[PDB]
Short mmCIF file of N, CA and C in Angstrom, two decimals:
data_model
loop_
_atom_site.label_atom_id
_atom_site.label_comp_id
_atom_site.label_asym_id
_atom_site.label_seq_id
_atom_site.Cartn_x
_atom_site.Cartn_y
_atom_site.Cartn_z
N UNK A 1 96.37 109.52 153.58
CA UNK A 1 96.09 110.75 154.31
C UNK A 1 95.76 110.37 155.76
N UNK A 2 94.95 109.38 156.01
CA UNK A 2 94.70 108.94 157.39
C UNK A 2 95.92 108.47 158.06
N UNK A 3 96.79 107.70 157.41
CA UNK A 3 98.08 107.32 158.00
C UNK A 3 98.96 108.58 158.37
N UNK A 4 99.03 109.55 157.46
CA UNK A 4 99.83 110.71 157.72
C UNK A 4 99.25 111.50 158.92
N UNK A 5 97.95 111.74 159.00
CA UNK A 5 97.33 112.36 160.12
C UNK A 5 97.53 111.61 161.44
N UNK A 6 97.34 110.27 161.42
CA UNK A 6 97.63 109.54 162.67
C UNK A 6 99.00 109.54 163.08
N UNK A 7 99.98 109.51 162.22
CA UNK A 7 101.38 109.60 162.55
C UNK A 7 101.74 111.02 163.01
N UNK A 8 100.96 111.98 162.66
CA UNK A 8 101.20 113.42 163.03
C UNK A 8 100.44 113.80 164.30
N UNK A 9 99.75 112.90 164.98
CA UNK A 9 99.04 113.02 166.21
C UNK A 9 97.68 113.70 165.91
N UNK A 10 97.32 114.06 164.67
CA UNK A 10 96.09 114.61 164.37
C UNK A 10 94.98 113.62 164.49
N UNK A 11 94.33 113.44 165.68
CA UNK A 11 93.37 112.35 165.86
C UNK A 11 92.06 112.61 165.10
N UNK A 12 91.55 113.83 165.11
CA UNK A 12 90.17 114.05 164.62
C UNK A 12 90.18 113.84 163.11
N UNK A 13 91.14 114.44 162.42
CA UNK A 13 91.08 114.36 161.02
C UNK A 13 91.28 112.97 160.48
N UNK A 14 92.23 112.19 161.14
CA UNK A 14 92.42 110.82 160.84
C UNK A 14 91.15 109.99 161.09
N UNK A 15 90.38 110.26 162.19
CA UNK A 15 89.25 109.59 162.53
C UNK A 15 88.21 109.79 161.40
N UNK A 16 88.02 111.09 160.96
CA UNK A 16 87.08 111.37 159.99
C UNK A 16 87.41 110.72 158.63
N UNK A 17 88.73 110.75 158.25
CA UNK A 17 89.12 110.14 157.01
C UNK A 17 88.90 108.53 157.04
N UNK A 18 89.19 107.92 158.22
CA UNK A 18 89.06 106.53 158.26
C UNK A 18 87.53 106.17 158.22
N UNK A 19 86.70 106.98 158.90
CA UNK A 19 85.22 106.71 158.82
C UNK A 19 84.78 106.84 157.40
N UNK A 20 85.11 107.89 156.66
CA UNK A 20 84.72 108.18 155.30
C UNK A 20 85.10 107.02 154.36
N UNK A 21 86.44 106.61 154.47
CA UNK A 21 86.92 105.53 153.54
C UNK A 21 86.14 104.22 153.88
N UNK A 22 85.97 103.90 155.18
CA UNK A 22 85.29 102.66 155.47
C UNK A 22 83.84 102.74 154.98
N UNK A 23 83.14 103.85 155.13
CA UNK A 23 81.76 103.92 154.66
C UNK A 23 81.68 103.84 153.19
N UNK A 24 82.59 104.42 152.45
CA UNK A 24 82.62 104.31 150.96
C UNK A 24 82.90 102.90 150.58
N UNK A 25 83.82 102.29 151.18
CA UNK A 25 84.28 100.88 150.84
C UNK A 25 83.20 99.91 151.14
N UNK A 26 82.49 100.04 152.25
CA UNK A 26 81.44 99.09 152.52
C UNK A 26 80.46 98.83 151.37
N UNK A 27 80.09 99.82 150.70
CA UNK A 27 79.21 99.74 149.56
C UNK A 27 79.70 98.85 148.46
N UNK A 28 80.96 98.90 148.10
CA UNK A 28 81.50 98.12 147.04
C UNK A 28 82.66 97.20 147.36
N UNK A 29 82.95 97.18 148.65
CA UNK A 29 84.21 96.42 149.16
C UNK A 29 83.77 95.42 150.19
N UNK A 30 84.65 94.47 150.48
CA UNK A 30 84.29 93.50 151.57
C UNK A 30 84.06 94.23 152.83
N UNK A 31 83.08 93.76 153.65
CA UNK A 31 82.61 94.48 154.79
C UNK A 31 83.51 94.19 155.97
N UNK A 32 84.50 93.33 155.89
CA UNK A 32 85.36 93.15 157.07
C UNK A 32 86.10 94.37 157.46
N UNK A 33 86.63 95.09 156.40
CA UNK A 33 87.29 96.34 156.77
C UNK A 33 86.35 97.42 157.34
N UNK A 34 85.15 97.40 156.79
CA UNK A 34 84.15 98.37 157.32
C UNK A 34 83.88 98.04 158.77
N UNK A 35 83.63 96.79 159.15
CA UNK A 35 83.41 96.42 160.50
C UNK A 35 84.60 96.75 161.43
N UNK A 36 85.77 96.51 161.00
CA UNK A 36 86.96 96.77 161.77
C UNK A 36 87.11 98.24 162.05
N UNK A 37 86.91 99.04 160.98
CA UNK A 37 87.09 100.51 161.14
C UNK A 37 86.06 101.12 161.94
N UNK A 38 84.75 100.63 161.77
CA UNK A 38 83.70 101.19 162.64
C UNK A 38 83.86 100.86 164.02
N UNK A 39 84.28 99.65 164.36
CA UNK A 39 84.50 99.24 165.69
C UNK A 39 85.69 100.00 166.32
N UNK A 40 86.71 100.19 165.62
CA UNK A 40 87.87 101.02 166.08
C UNK A 40 87.45 102.42 166.33
N UNK A 41 86.81 103.11 165.42
CA UNK A 41 86.40 104.47 165.64
C UNK A 41 85.46 104.57 166.80
N UNK A 42 84.52 103.60 166.96
CA UNK A 42 83.65 103.59 168.14
C UNK A 42 84.40 103.49 169.48
N UNK A 43 85.39 102.60 169.44
CA UNK A 43 86.25 102.45 170.62
C UNK A 43 86.95 103.77 170.96
N UNK A 44 87.51 104.39 169.94
CA UNK A 44 88.18 105.68 170.11
C UNK A 44 87.13 106.77 170.67
N UNK A 45 85.98 106.79 170.10
CA UNK A 45 84.98 107.83 170.44
C UNK A 45 84.40 107.71 171.82
N UNK A 46 84.00 106.43 172.23
CA UNK A 46 83.24 106.28 173.46
C UNK A 46 83.99 106.83 174.64
N UNK A 47 85.30 106.64 174.71
CA UNK A 47 86.03 107.22 175.90
C UNK A 47 85.97 108.72 175.87
N UNK A 48 86.07 109.40 174.74
CA UNK A 48 85.96 110.78 174.63
C UNK A 48 84.54 111.23 174.72
N UNK A 49 84.25 112.46 175.28
CA UNK A 49 82.93 112.96 175.29
C UNK A 49 82.42 113.60 174.03
N UNK A 50 83.25 113.76 173.03
CA UNK A 50 82.87 114.36 171.79
C UNK A 50 81.73 113.61 171.07
N UNK A 51 82.11 112.38 170.68
CA UNK A 51 81.15 111.55 169.88
C UNK A 51 80.53 110.43 170.72
N UNK A 52 80.54 110.56 172.06
CA UNK A 52 79.99 109.50 172.86
C UNK A 52 78.41 109.47 172.69
N UNK A 53 77.82 110.62 172.47
CA UNK A 53 76.40 110.71 172.32
C UNK A 53 75.92 110.35 170.97
N UNK A 54 76.85 110.17 169.98
CA UNK A 54 76.50 109.78 168.61
C UNK A 54 77.18 108.56 168.15
N UNK A 55 77.99 107.85 169.00
CA UNK A 55 78.58 106.64 168.60
C UNK A 55 77.58 105.50 168.40
N UNK A 56 76.29 105.71 168.86
CA UNK A 56 75.26 104.76 168.59
C UNK A 56 75.04 104.59 167.08
N UNK A 57 75.27 105.75 166.33
CA UNK A 57 75.15 105.68 164.87
C UNK A 57 76.18 104.84 164.28
N UNK A 58 77.44 104.96 164.75
CA UNK A 58 78.52 104.13 164.23
C UNK A 58 78.30 102.61 164.59
N UNK A 59 77.84 102.39 165.77
CA UNK A 59 77.52 100.97 166.16
C UNK A 59 76.43 100.46 165.32
N UNK A 60 75.38 101.26 165.00
CA UNK A 60 74.32 100.83 164.18
C UNK A 60 74.82 100.52 162.74
N UNK A 61 75.73 101.33 162.22
CA UNK A 61 76.30 101.07 160.88
C UNK A 61 77.06 99.77 160.86
N UNK A 62 77.84 99.50 161.96
CA UNK A 62 78.52 98.26 161.98
C UNK A 62 77.65 97.05 162.10
N UNK A 63 76.58 97.18 162.99
CA UNK A 63 75.66 96.13 163.07
C UNK A 63 74.93 95.81 161.76
N UNK A 64 74.56 96.93 161.02
CA UNK A 64 73.93 96.68 159.77
C UNK A 64 74.85 96.00 158.78
N UNK A 65 76.18 96.36 158.81
CA UNK A 65 77.16 95.59 157.93
C UNK A 65 77.22 94.20 158.32
N UNK A 66 77.18 93.88 159.69
CA UNK A 66 77.19 92.58 160.11
C UNK A 66 75.95 91.78 159.58
N UNK A 67 74.76 92.40 159.68
CA UNK A 67 73.52 91.85 159.25
C UNK A 67 73.58 91.43 157.82
N UNK A 68 74.19 92.31 156.96
CA UNK A 68 74.31 92.07 155.53
C UNK A 68 75.08 90.75 155.18
N UNK A 69 75.91 90.28 156.16
CA UNK A 69 76.59 89.00 156.01
C UNK A 69 75.71 87.87 156.41
N UNK A 70 75.31 87.82 157.77
CA UNK A 70 74.51 86.80 158.24
C UNK A 70 73.73 87.32 159.51
N UNK A 71 73.01 86.44 160.14
CA UNK A 71 72.16 86.85 161.30
C UNK A 71 72.76 86.47 162.64
N UNK A 72 73.27 85.23 162.75
CA UNK A 72 73.78 84.79 164.02
C UNK A 72 75.00 85.69 164.44
N UNK A 73 75.89 85.96 163.56
CA UNK A 73 76.99 86.82 163.89
C UNK A 73 76.47 88.23 164.23
N UNK A 74 75.43 88.67 163.53
CA UNK A 74 74.80 89.96 163.91
C UNK A 74 74.26 89.90 165.35
N UNK A 75 73.57 88.82 165.74
CA UNK A 75 73.14 88.71 167.15
C UNK A 75 74.31 88.75 168.09
N UNK A 76 75.39 88.05 167.79
CA UNK A 76 76.57 88.15 168.65
C UNK A 76 77.20 89.50 168.73
N UNK A 77 77.25 90.16 167.62
CA UNK A 77 77.74 91.55 167.58
C UNK A 77 76.91 92.46 168.43
N UNK A 78 75.57 92.41 168.30
CA UNK A 78 74.70 93.33 169.04
C UNK A 78 74.85 93.05 170.51
N UNK A 79 74.79 91.80 170.97
CA UNK A 79 74.93 91.51 172.41
C UNK A 79 76.31 91.92 172.86
N UNK A 80 77.39 91.68 172.18
CA UNK A 80 78.68 92.27 172.55
C UNK A 80 78.69 93.78 172.72
N UNK A 81 78.03 94.43 171.72
CA UNK A 81 78.00 95.95 171.76
C UNK A 81 77.26 96.38 173.03
N UNK A 82 76.12 95.76 173.29
CA UNK A 82 75.27 96.26 174.38
C UNK A 82 75.95 95.85 175.71
N UNK A 83 76.74 94.77 175.77
CA UNK A 83 77.42 94.41 177.03
C UNK A 83 78.61 95.47 177.28
N UNK A 84 79.24 95.84 176.12
CA UNK A 84 80.34 96.87 176.28
C UNK A 84 79.72 98.22 176.38
N UNK A 85 78.58 98.51 175.85
CA UNK A 85 77.94 99.81 175.76
C UNK A 85 76.56 99.62 176.28
N UNK A 86 76.34 99.59 177.60
CA UNK A 86 74.93 99.35 178.19
C UNK A 86 73.93 100.47 177.69
N UNK A 87 74.40 101.69 177.41
CA UNK A 87 73.45 102.72 177.00
C UNK A 87 72.90 102.41 175.55
N UNK A 88 73.49 101.50 174.85
CA UNK A 88 72.98 101.16 173.55
C UNK A 88 71.68 100.38 173.55
N UNK A 89 71.37 99.76 174.68
CA UNK A 89 70.21 98.90 174.72
C UNK A 89 68.90 99.69 174.56
N UNK A 90 68.77 100.75 175.37
CA UNK A 90 67.56 101.50 175.36
C UNK A 90 67.45 102.36 174.08
N UNK A 91 68.51 102.46 173.26
CA UNK A 91 68.42 103.32 172.06
C UNK A 91 67.37 102.72 171.13
N UNK A 92 66.60 103.61 170.44
CA UNK A 92 65.61 103.21 169.47
C UNK A 92 66.19 102.40 168.33
N UNK A 93 67.50 102.64 168.05
CA UNK A 93 68.20 101.86 167.01
C UNK A 93 68.19 100.32 167.37
N UNK A 94 68.46 100.06 168.65
CA UNK A 94 68.39 98.66 169.09
C UNK A 94 67.06 98.04 168.99
N UNK A 95 65.99 98.78 169.35
CA UNK A 95 64.64 98.27 169.13
C UNK A 95 64.32 97.99 167.66
N UNK A 96 64.72 98.95 166.80
CA UNK A 96 64.51 98.74 165.37
C UNK A 96 65.22 97.44 164.88
N UNK A 97 66.49 97.35 165.32
CA UNK A 97 67.27 96.16 164.97
C UNK A 97 66.60 94.86 165.42
N UNK A 98 66.11 94.83 166.61
CA UNK A 98 65.50 93.68 167.22
C UNK A 98 64.20 93.31 166.37
N UNK A 99 63.40 94.30 166.08
CA UNK A 99 62.22 94.01 165.31
C UNK A 99 62.59 93.51 163.92
N UNK A 100 63.68 94.17 163.37
CA UNK A 100 64.09 93.73 161.99
C UNK A 100 64.51 92.29 161.97
N UNK A 101 65.41 91.89 163.00
CA UNK A 101 65.84 90.54 162.98
C UNK A 101 64.76 89.56 163.34
N UNK A 102 63.84 89.93 164.16
CA UNK A 102 62.71 89.00 164.49
C UNK A 102 61.91 88.76 163.17
N UNK A 103 61.64 89.87 162.47
CA UNK A 103 60.87 89.75 161.20
C UNK A 103 61.62 88.87 160.19
N UNK A 104 62.98 89.04 160.10
CA UNK A 104 63.75 88.28 159.11
C UNK A 104 63.76 86.83 159.53
N UNK A 105 63.90 86.51 160.80
CA UNK A 105 63.80 85.14 161.23
C UNK A 105 62.43 84.51 161.02
N UNK A 106 61.33 85.36 161.12
CA UNK A 106 59.98 84.87 160.97
C UNK A 106 59.69 84.73 159.44
N UNK A 107 60.58 85.31 158.63
CA UNK A 107 60.29 85.32 157.18
C UNK A 107 58.90 85.84 156.81
N UNK A 108 58.64 87.08 157.37
CA UNK A 108 57.48 87.79 157.08
C UNK A 108 57.73 89.14 156.48
N UNK A 109 57.64 89.14 155.21
CA UNK A 109 58.09 90.36 154.39
C UNK A 109 57.17 91.53 154.89
N UNK A 110 55.91 91.30 155.13
CA UNK A 110 54.99 92.40 155.46
C UNK A 110 55.46 93.05 156.77
N UNK A 111 55.84 92.28 157.74
CA UNK A 111 56.22 92.85 159.04
C UNK A 111 57.53 93.69 158.86
N UNK A 112 58.53 93.19 158.14
CA UNK A 112 59.78 93.95 157.93
C UNK A 112 59.46 95.24 157.18
N UNK A 113 58.59 95.18 156.08
CA UNK A 113 58.25 96.43 155.31
C UNK A 113 57.60 97.41 156.15
N UNK A 114 56.64 97.01 156.92
CA UNK A 114 55.92 97.96 157.88
C UNK A 114 56.85 98.49 158.89
N UNK A 115 57.76 97.65 159.43
CA UNK A 115 58.68 98.23 160.40
C UNK A 115 59.62 99.32 159.81
N UNK A 116 60.16 99.08 158.62
CA UNK A 116 60.98 100.02 158.03
C UNK A 116 60.20 101.27 157.63
N UNK A 117 58.95 101.13 157.21
CA UNK A 117 58.08 102.29 156.88
C UNK A 117 57.75 103.09 158.11
N UNK A 118 57.53 102.41 159.26
CA UNK A 118 57.26 103.09 160.47
C UNK A 118 58.50 103.90 160.95
N UNK A 119 59.64 103.26 160.79
CA UNK A 119 60.89 103.99 161.13
C UNK A 119 61.11 105.24 160.22
N UNK A 120 60.81 105.08 158.96
CA UNK A 120 61.01 106.16 158.00
C UNK A 120 60.03 107.27 158.18
N UNK A 121 58.79 106.97 158.76
CA UNK A 121 57.83 108.01 158.96
C UNK A 121 58.51 109.09 159.89
N UNK A 122 59.11 108.72 161.00
CA UNK A 122 59.93 109.63 161.80
C UNK A 122 61.32 109.59 161.14
N UNK A 123 62.03 110.74 161.31
CA UNK A 123 63.42 110.83 160.82
C UNK A 123 63.25 110.73 159.30
N UNK A 124 64.35 110.43 158.65
CA UNK A 124 64.35 110.22 157.16
C UNK A 124 65.52 109.33 156.76
N UNK A 125 65.24 108.39 155.85
CA UNK A 125 66.28 107.45 155.40
C UNK A 125 67.20 108.12 154.48
N UNK A 126 68.38 107.43 154.24
CA UNK A 126 69.45 107.84 153.33
C UNK A 126 69.59 106.84 152.26
N UNK A 127 70.22 107.32 151.12
CA UNK A 127 70.45 106.44 150.00
C UNK A 127 71.22 105.24 150.39
N UNK A 128 72.31 105.35 151.16
CA UNK A 128 73.04 104.19 151.62
C UNK A 128 72.24 103.30 152.47
N UNK A 129 71.51 103.82 153.43
CA UNK A 129 70.70 103.01 154.25
C UNK A 129 69.59 102.24 153.57
N UNK A 130 68.94 102.94 152.63
CA UNK A 130 67.91 102.27 151.85
C UNK A 130 68.53 101.17 150.93
N UNK A 131 69.71 101.47 150.37
CA UNK A 131 70.27 100.44 149.57
C UNK A 131 70.65 99.21 150.37
N UNK A 132 71.22 99.39 151.53
CA UNK A 132 71.58 98.27 152.37
C UNK A 132 70.40 97.49 152.79
N UNK A 133 69.36 98.18 153.18
CA UNK A 133 68.10 97.49 153.64
C UNK A 133 67.54 96.67 152.49
N UNK A 134 67.50 97.31 151.28
CA UNK A 134 66.95 96.54 150.13
C UNK A 134 67.84 95.32 149.83
N UNK A 135 69.15 95.50 149.85
CA UNK A 135 70.09 94.40 149.59
C UNK A 135 69.85 93.18 150.54
N UNK A 136 69.71 93.53 151.88
CA UNK A 136 69.52 92.45 152.83
C UNK A 136 68.10 91.82 152.62
N UNK A 137 67.15 92.66 152.21
CA UNK A 137 65.72 92.18 152.00
C UNK A 137 65.74 91.20 150.82
N UNK A 138 66.46 91.53 149.76
CA UNK A 138 66.35 90.65 148.49
C UNK A 138 66.75 89.17 148.80
N UNK A 139 67.70 88.91 149.67
CA UNK A 139 68.13 87.55 149.95
C UNK A 139 67.31 86.91 151.00
N UNK A 140 66.05 87.43 151.33
CA UNK A 140 65.25 86.76 152.36
C UNK A 140 64.78 85.37 151.88
N UNK A 141 64.52 85.20 150.60
CA UNK A 141 64.14 83.88 150.06
C UNK A 141 62.92 83.37 150.77
N UNK B 1 3.66 114.61 177.52
CA UNK B 1 4.25 114.70 176.20
C UNK B 1 5.40 115.70 176.22
N UNK B 2 5.83 116.12 177.41
CA UNK B 2 6.96 117.05 177.65
C UNK B 2 7.91 116.47 178.67
N UNK B 3 9.19 116.79 178.35
CA UNK B 3 10.26 116.49 179.33
C UNK B 3 11.45 117.41 179.01
N UNK B 4 11.69 118.30 180.01
CA UNK B 4 12.88 119.13 179.86
C UNK B 4 14.06 118.38 180.24
N UNK B 5 15.21 118.62 179.57
CA UNK B 5 16.39 117.82 179.81
C UNK B 5 17.59 118.77 180.06
N UNK B 6 18.41 118.35 181.06
CA UNK B 6 19.73 119.03 181.33
C UNK B 6 20.86 118.25 180.70
N UNK B 7 21.97 118.95 180.57
CA UNK B 7 23.15 118.38 179.89
C UNK B 7 24.45 118.62 180.81
N UNK B 8 25.38 117.77 180.59
CA UNK B 8 26.60 117.83 181.21
C UNK B 8 27.76 117.72 180.29
N UNK B 9 28.68 118.63 180.23
CA UNK B 9 29.81 118.64 179.29
C UNK B 9 31.10 118.14 179.94
N UNK B 10 32.08 117.86 179.07
CA UNK B 10 33.40 117.42 179.50
C UNK B 10 34.45 118.16 178.73
N UNK B 11 35.57 118.41 179.38
CA UNK B 11 36.74 119.05 178.77
C UNK B 11 37.54 118.08 178.01
N UNK B 12 38.51 118.58 177.20
CA UNK B 12 39.39 117.84 176.42
C UNK B 12 40.83 118.01 176.87
N UNK B 13 41.60 117.06 177.14
CA UNK B 13 43.00 117.25 177.49
C UNK B 13 43.84 117.61 176.24
N UNK B 14 43.70 118.91 175.95
CA UNK B 14 44.45 119.46 174.85
C UNK B 14 45.96 119.21 175.07
N UNK B 15 46.56 118.74 174.01
CA UNK B 15 48.04 118.39 174.09
C UNK B 15 48.71 119.16 172.98
N UNK B 16 49.71 120.00 173.36
CA UNK B 16 50.51 120.72 172.42
C UNK B 16 51.43 119.79 171.53
N UNK B 17 51.74 118.62 172.07
CA UNK B 17 52.73 117.77 171.41
C UNK B 17 52.10 116.45 170.94
N UNK B 18 50.75 116.49 170.56
CA UNK B 18 50.17 115.28 169.97
C UNK B 18 50.14 115.27 168.48
N UNK B 19 50.44 116.46 167.84
CA UNK B 19 50.65 116.50 166.38
C UNK B 19 51.13 117.86 166.06
N UNK B 20 51.91 117.97 165.09
CA UNK B 20 52.55 119.28 164.54
C UNK B 20 53.57 119.80 165.49
N UNK B 21 53.70 119.20 166.70
CA UNK B 21 54.82 119.43 167.54
C UNK B 21 55.61 118.24 167.90
N UNK B 22 55.15 117.04 167.57
CA UNK B 22 56.04 115.84 167.43
C UNK B 22 56.90 116.07 166.27
N UNK B 23 56.38 116.62 165.12
CA UNK B 23 57.27 117.06 164.05
C UNK B 23 58.19 118.18 164.55
N UNK B 24 57.72 119.11 165.40
CA UNK B 24 58.61 120.11 165.97
C UNK B 24 59.65 119.53 166.95
N UNK B 25 59.30 118.46 167.64
CA UNK B 25 60.29 117.68 168.42
C UNK B 25 61.35 117.14 167.54
N UNK B 26 60.99 116.52 166.37
CA UNK B 26 61.93 115.96 165.40
C UNK B 26 62.77 117.16 164.91
N UNK B 27 62.17 118.38 164.59
CA UNK B 27 62.89 119.58 164.19
C UNK B 27 63.77 120.05 165.37
N UNK B 28 63.50 119.71 166.63
CA UNK B 28 64.29 120.04 167.71
C UNK B 28 65.36 118.97 168.02
N UNK B 29 65.02 117.70 167.73
CA UNK B 29 65.95 116.66 168.13
C UNK B 29 66.85 116.38 166.83
N UNK B 30 66.23 115.92 165.75
CA UNK B 30 67.00 115.56 164.56
C UNK B 30 67.63 116.69 163.87
N UNK B 31 67.15 117.89 164.08
CA UNK B 31 67.78 119.08 163.34
C UNK B 31 68.50 119.99 164.21
N UNK B 32 67.87 120.57 165.24
CA UNK B 32 68.55 121.57 166.02
C UNK B 32 69.72 120.97 166.83
N UNK B 33 69.49 119.76 167.44
CA UNK B 33 70.57 119.16 168.23
C UNK B 33 71.57 118.46 167.29
N UNK B 34 71.16 117.99 166.17
CA UNK B 34 72.09 117.57 165.15
C UNK B 34 73.00 118.73 164.65
#
């Protein structure tokens, strides 16, 4: 369906379909496709004014997918994103990511748990986000 | 055995957004603008 919409010039529907399929696949599929699709949709969105103010969420999803693989590549991804998207640095998502990665490198379970709880106090977490956070936490060792 | 005393009071910097309207900011940011 996404291919049909893209070939028919329907940009919005194809974008939504690609985002949905990538998000669903990331849970049970290799995360390379999720990273690629999230980066592509972010590249499409940032130029347009529609999703420019919310592309931070897509970049956060891609960065979280990167973190579930390893940490060094996550650092490279975040620095690349902020270099390409300077407005991403001041975002509270970037601060939360920085605290999370610092805690993970410090191997301090309490710090990570209190950081995630503090983030959850404001806003509200989602099933997918909680699952990904728990999955990355389990392999702290 | 007597000493009359005077008192001096101070006001409080009442804040509308220090609780129950930070939640309303979230209801304005995370909900209304979403």
